[PDB]
Design a protein around this ligand. Structure first.
Ligand SMILES: *[C@@H]1O[C@H](CO)[C@@H](O)[C@H](O)[C@H]1NC(C)=O
Ligand SMILES: *[C@@H]1O[C@H](CO)[C@@H](O)[C@H](O)[C@H]1NC(C)=O
Ligand SMILES: *[C@@H]1O[C@H](CO)[C@@H](O)[C@H](O)[C@H]1NC(C)=O
Lengths: 164, 321, 164, 164, 321, 321
């Protein structure tokens, strides 16, 4: 957790959410449920799809390898051939493996970022009108039905709703 | 009261990935980009079938080793398969000049057409049907390479040969010929009367003169004598000229290069499977969409990139616990 | 927005700011205006200048290429020559392109970081004495002229200014 | 400071802390002191140990180099030999140096992340019961002895402790 | 009320960059590091002018093809420009031994000085002015290469030549000579009386013996005969020794290597522009501060790094909308 | 009141690191991964001592230059050390065929055993103890290479030699021999009576015929004559056959290859130190756990990776001020 959201202040994940990577869980008068954030989830999808195809596409002209034979008195250039082909093989193997190691990390922390920023997107809406529990949950001081919830989950929460 | 919470997806996946700072991280979604499977067969390559020399080598094939008659006439191939150590090569001991260069040329050819450039019947004043050896046997009887003819003396005389051939074709010609290096002067006279001989060969580009080396050497296949073979590429409308007073292994059949293309000479102990593929390696064919494989560097066809990794998994989902 | 500032809780950028990358917009008694943060902007300048010259300098010993000719019977080593020079060409092309792809991203998110941390630098100064609007703006409970503003924009905001 | 913690809102480091990378300084009735966070510090240790050994291990099959000699009329393949060996030497030198440049940065900002998330781990515990000073310090409204402190530094701070 | 806000720069720039996770991101500031432009000319390289062989090749130049007299005496060059397929090469058909090695040597030379090592007048007992052919014509009359002399018999006799030359200079000498391979024994006697001939050439390092190969070959430039050329590098204070009783194409002019240096042999169909540059490619010169170009791998001078990309743009500013 | 604060470690370290965006960043902890030190000695490599040819070269060693007797019998080596310009090479001027290929073979050998294949006493009808020169002197008196014998005529006659040797051993044999190229016909008859001579050499794989080239050449070590040396590898149970009527530098001692292995031929001006190491470079040995060094590309033993950097420091701690 480079951004402290996933496996950070949030204790784990929701098996129940099956429609996206990040979302909300609500509990009101009319009932409780889950709802994935189509925005951040879609942007994430384009993020990893584009990353994947970028990594694949960047490495399509690697090094091909054709067989060449040499006699008993061409041992030096046979050695040169062998060492150069193994050489390229090694630099490209290193490139692939290394790139995987880097972009895996950047990807996980990208998810972390998405969750944190989602949480903040809400926190900045429900200012005084709710309290921060500390586990990624907000406790309301007012009463929010499925319409106040829907209006939150699209950015249009109307703070004008008093306090105390 | 009333509550809203923000959270993230979790599932029942055991797909681990690695990072620079942590190994074996279980995550929700992961894609594998490394192919690690082949079928263990030698398959056709997009409909066109490989040339599988079994216990014959390229030299035995092209020169016409009597034990290589399976490949007397060979159709278009996608690639050639030779063993690491073919048993049927040069039945008569000796060497093949610029052999590796010729194999390299073969990696650029998909189809030969064997044509007769000099009939055996055209040898008036020499014997063309007695040039056979027990080291090149066919069915327990002395034979010789089929595409070249070992000319010997007729009526105790070897008149100097002057023979030319104009490549009237529009394909390039692979032309093979040879010289015989006897073991002793007695053999030289027994075979060609004339004590001191030569073979001169000329084209627009080629201008060489071979002289037999008569000497005692250790025995190979029971023989102390040797055959040394040469080849050249005759351009369309160019001619090849031979002049010799002995030791001349004349050409009989040559090879038209009717199909240039991308080919390869694979070293594999495997035999023909009855299958098709788009990507072939010495150990087997590949059916994959994956961008990488770790099977074999040597590859032919639309193939993934060879890489020395046994594991390349790319994370798509998020961390799981 | 990996840090959620640029195109995040801030809805976009100020055409009016023409003296730096990050800054403030104030509106008081004496009037309104913009002022770029010379600190974070300068550090950013050194950040991207140093990154640029690091990328250029790291790749000055690439692979040169000299012409070599081979005859009709040197086809194998001609092939070796050709494949090795194209090989290096490919690994270096890959290196350049890849490096660009990585450092572009790291650079953009570096700007994001700068903005977020600037915002926090202020937020941590104007604690109770102002409210967080949610768009990167603070509404004052007290009255701040151009001297309270200047004192904010250099880190010396005096919180001792009551509340309520 | 990509995450704004180290050399950000925290003005510098504690010489007095000698048992870890991140920790706390308390001042109560019974006295004052320092205490490193064994959790985040341990995870950091595994982070940099694994990074180090990953960088070393990824580059053990580099390019070896064997001496080959050529006569006066093998100048072309001598040149080919020379240029290919220097070529690989250069791509690997570039790889090592570049990788160092990248992972150094990622490492420093990883520490930044650790500190920020530690601070947040506390801030989310001591909600109303303490005020944010702005320098990484919390001023208590209640009274916390070494047991309230120990309970904080292991995640078990009991907020049920009134306010005002 | 009173408000302060924190925000970021935005401008009217349409300069897009790419990242690993997003393409075509419009930003405020971006620097381009890839040069994609040349002038399409062949320019001087820092004041010193290239050697542009037009329809002559290196062989035609060095041997002195009569159709290559433009380059009889050539000043210091920065680099050499030869076409892919020069028309004026070996007017008399034949070959040039270790040709590619010599071209490679030329990539290391910036200036030759042609000096006369053996005067044509010094050939007492042979004819030095009759060695000409209609295959090497000059102005519609039989000529020959200018820097070598085709010696023939005088008064129906070819006495054995012994000629030595001590390199009194301190520069290394490029020395060229040749052998003539006739088409028939009649030509051999017509040209050099002696039926069986040789050329022996020796230095401190060189010790070779050439013998003419007399044979019928296909015609090239109307000729079935051939000329085979050789070259060597004479060290300062070393001597070269020639002994021959026929078929000897003696040297007349040799080349002092007065300026070693970094040069190159470019294959370009282009001709001389009247310009200067610091970086030259086969398709044109470059005037850039950019660290990269994508024009041509083959380059000479203070040049950017060749790269196969058509776009390399580095972000300096921040995201724009 | 009561306060808790969160903070980070700081110490008194001046260890700077570099990043992509900032140079010279002082930090708390940093590890160095680049070795920059060697001992300046030539050491044993894991107990087995190098072969240090001092002013002798490989040719002088193997042929048995009289000035190279220090290396008459040489034990197993780890690696060979030759100078850039050894003074004791071919005392008698001439050349060594496929020299570089042989050196390359030597990079694959750790131990030779010199055995006598043809006794000097076995030369009945020729003189075997008169083949000496003032260009190959031993202690101010004419000598010659020790492992080959310069056969000359006995009683004004040089009968044709036929000598064969069967490799009864199970190791491969390095066999060296030579030809003498006189300066004139007078020398040819003075040394071997017979005017026109040859050397024919044959194995299962080898079939060559050398003829002496008699010619005037410039003097090297006072001589205009030359010696040309050849070598071959005799397989177990194969034989080598020599036939010659003159100019033959017969073999006397050959070399058993009893230990194949990974070796190297270092060019170093250094001399033997009395030390051990696990990693050796031409400029000195290395004692390191570090994964990288920047000392020399050419290396033998368990070594770090060569890299062109003079600084590679990896950050472990955090920023310090
Ligand atoms: C081959 O034959 C054709 C026509 O018969 C002729 O044009 C050509 O000159 C011949 N080739 C040679 C080199 O003799
Ligand atoms: C060339 O001449 C100089 C002086 O005339 C002499 O020192 C040298 O020995 C000669 N070179 C040879 C190898 O004959
Ligand atoms: C060498 O000798 C052994 C036995 O003496 C024999 O088997 C072998 O044929 C000989 N080698 C040759 C090629 O003469």
């Amino acid at each position: 957790g480079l951004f402290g959201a996933i496996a950070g202040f949030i204790e784990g994940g929701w098996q129940g959410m099956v429609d996206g990577w990040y979302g909300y869980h609500h509990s009101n008068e009319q009932g409780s449920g889950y709802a994935a954030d189509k925005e951040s989830t879609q942007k994430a999808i384009d993020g990893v799809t584009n990353k994947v195809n970028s990594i694949i596409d960047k490495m399509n002209t690697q090094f091909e390898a054709v067989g060449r034979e040499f006699n008993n008195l061409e041992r030096r250039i046979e050695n040169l051939n062998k060492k150069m082909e193994d050489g390229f093989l090694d630099v490209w193997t290193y490139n692939a493996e290394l790139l995987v190691l880097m972009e895996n990390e950047r990807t996980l922390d990208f998810h972390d970022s998405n969750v944190k920023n989602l949480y903040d997107k809400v926190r900045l809406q429900l200012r005084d009108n709710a309290k921060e529990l500390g586990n990624g949950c907000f406790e309301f001081y007012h009463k929010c039905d499925n319409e106040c919830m829907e209006s939150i989950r699209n950015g249009t929460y109307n703070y004008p709703q008093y306090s105390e | 009261q009333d509550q809203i919470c923000i959270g993230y997806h979790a599932n029942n996946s055991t797909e681990q990935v690695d990072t620079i700072m942590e190994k074996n991280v279980t995550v929700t979604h992961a894609q594998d980009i490394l192919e690690k499977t082949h079928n263990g067969k030698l398959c056709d390559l997009d409909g066109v079938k490989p040339l599988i020399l079994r216990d014959c080598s390229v030299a035995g094939w092209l020169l016409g080793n009597p034990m290589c008659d399976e490949f007397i006439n060979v159709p278009e191939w996608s690639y050639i398969v030779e063993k690491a150590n073919p048993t049927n090569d040069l039945c008569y001991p000796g060497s093949f000049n610029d052999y590796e260069e010729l194999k390299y040329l073969l990696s650029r050819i998909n189809h030969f057409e064997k044509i007769q450039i000099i009939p055996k019947s055209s040898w008036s004043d020499h014997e063309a049907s007695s040039g056979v050896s027990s080291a090149c046997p066919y069915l327990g009887s002395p034979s010789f390479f089929r595409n070249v003819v070992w000319l010997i003396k007729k009526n105790s005389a070897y008149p100097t040969i002057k023979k030319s051939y104009n490549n009237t074709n529009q394909e390039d010609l692979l032309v093979l010929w040879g010289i015989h290096h006897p073991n002793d002067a007695a053999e030289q006279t027994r075979l060609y009367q004339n004590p001191t001989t030569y073979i001169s060969i000329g084209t627009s580009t080629l201008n060489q003169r071979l002289v037999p080396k008569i000497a005692t050497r250790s025995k190979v296949n029971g023989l102390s004598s040797r055959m040394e073979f040469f080849w050249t590429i005759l351009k369309p409308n160019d001619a090849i000229n031979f002049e010799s007073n002995g030791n001349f292994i004349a050409p009989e059949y040559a090879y038209k290069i009717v199909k240039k293309g991308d080919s390869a000479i694979m070293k594999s102990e495997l035999e023909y499977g009855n299958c098709n593929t788009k990507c072939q390696t010495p150990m087997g064919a590949i059916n994959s969409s994956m961008p990488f494989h770790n099977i074999h560097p040597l590859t032919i066809g639309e193939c993934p990139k060879y890489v020395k990794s046994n594991r390349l998994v790319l994370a798509t989902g998020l961390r799981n616990s």
